[PDB]
């Protein structure tokens, strides 16, 4: 049976500032078996395997900078941030030749440690350790949209407000003629400082798509539904294949807005002003005298 | 030939703190045309539109807060801010009675607008205009997914530190015997403060799958390289079906790393301290006195 406590005392040892935590159990004398734990575990992993170990040889278990009972100081935890505490750990005890016992990024570190001084890995014991993995195709499937999006950052913000996207990208993508560099530079004017950006970042963020924003899903929905039913004289312009409203949600919409006229401005996407606006200008000027 | 230029005088009126731009031309009295851009636009949007309205009426072309020549103020720039400055500009001008034309974000601050001054409203042009979007098969496929993208937060960061995943989502996972609550309260001690989940997070970023981070995967490689032709000993424990190292690689690096033994710990996936490990202390204690 696995047993679930943790019966090791607290050895604590200052390096490079911070307090780490390791067990330390067995004798003195002779080659330390040094057991390096993961994430987002700790000694505690090991608390089952030291026992066995631990009536021959010195056992030395410690928490990992920002993890277990060590210390958790304000940094970005880079894997080479861990390893310059680690490096620091061994030599704050002093350790000379040792045994090493890896998991996991334990192994990483274990392994990356032992290349830097072979001369004093006198034996690896080693499970589930890093290697390169080439293709996410090896990674278990059960685990591997977790993982994925373990390293999915803020997209949209990436998108966005980073590389423009909804200047650089959309504008294009959403208008049928090509435009030019003149007019994507008018478009460009006013966000040329990406701070400026977040507007255009949280307008799709703010749109009624499958229930949320909530806030403006029921919004929209009420006024959607006075529109439905007042007698406002309505102009509804619409391409092909629109974007919004394309060209079957145009017909509908005829007839089911009160005093509603459509019209077909041709192949539009979703910037309808900037694939005829002549068209637009012309129709609306002359819907305006009869209201 | 579609006009390039903006050929409009420049108008600015004080909302809210703010200055704003505005397009401002055509006769004086009569009811104004109202021209409402959206994302990520501006009045520069009806450039070639309002010269046919111009000669018979007054039209207005505002820039929305944080757009165009309009002032850009630290906010997080919610549509309900959107709203606050359109209504005070709409009265910083005095405007009474207006004919909307409405587009895209701009539609829905029209809509919104006409629906609470409905007896204003003598008419409303519109073109590709929000209304709620039940299910993403409603938008275009060709942009579904970017549109996705951009709604798509900081997904990383949520599930680690917000959620934290790699406690209570990845533990359990990785384990094919089952967790106890007092196993998983050791776990879960050293992070109950979410911002302590700084390395529960950093650490599968730094995995070097697909080449990334390079620099992880590069010192990674060398100290594989490193280990396939040392000699030190090496014990490598594996379970089945892993999760790093599954049953096959296991079985090749049985060949591929000298001086190795290879114990199999029967089932088992990423934690196998967690699945056995009496063999695995077992084992390392009798491998122990013959380095």
Redesign the interface.
Known sequence: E?G?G?PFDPHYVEVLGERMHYVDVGPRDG?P?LFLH?????S??????????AP??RCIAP???????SD?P??????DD?VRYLDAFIEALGLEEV?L?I???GS?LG??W??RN?ER????????????????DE??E??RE??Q?????????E??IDQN???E???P??VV?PL?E??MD??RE??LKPV?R?????????????GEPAN??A??????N??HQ?P????????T??????PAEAARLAESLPNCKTVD?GPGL?????DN??L???E??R???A?
């Not at 999006?149 to 913000?157: E, I, N, Q, Y």
Request: glycine share 6%.
């Open positions: 696995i679930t943790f080659t078996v993961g994430n987002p575990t700790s505690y992993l090991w608390r089952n395997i030291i026992p066995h170990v021959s040889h928490d990992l900078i920002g993890m277990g009972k958790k304000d940094l970005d935890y880079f894997f861990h045994v016992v998991h996991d990024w990483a392994f990356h032992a290349k072979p890995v006198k034996g690896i014991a080693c499970m589930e350790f890093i290697r390169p993995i080439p293709t996410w990674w278990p059960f685990a977790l993982f999006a373990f390293r999915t950052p803020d997209v949209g913000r998108l966005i996207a909804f200047i990208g959309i504008l993508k959403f003629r030019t003149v007019e008018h478009y006013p966000f400026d977040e507007p255009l970042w949280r307008f799709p963020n703010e749109l009624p798509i499958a403006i899903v919004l929209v929905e009420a006024y959607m006075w529109l007042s406002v004289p309505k102009l509804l312009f619409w391409g294949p629109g974007v919004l409203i394309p401005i979703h910037y309808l002003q900037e606006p002549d637009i200008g012309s609306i000027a819907w305006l005298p209201l």
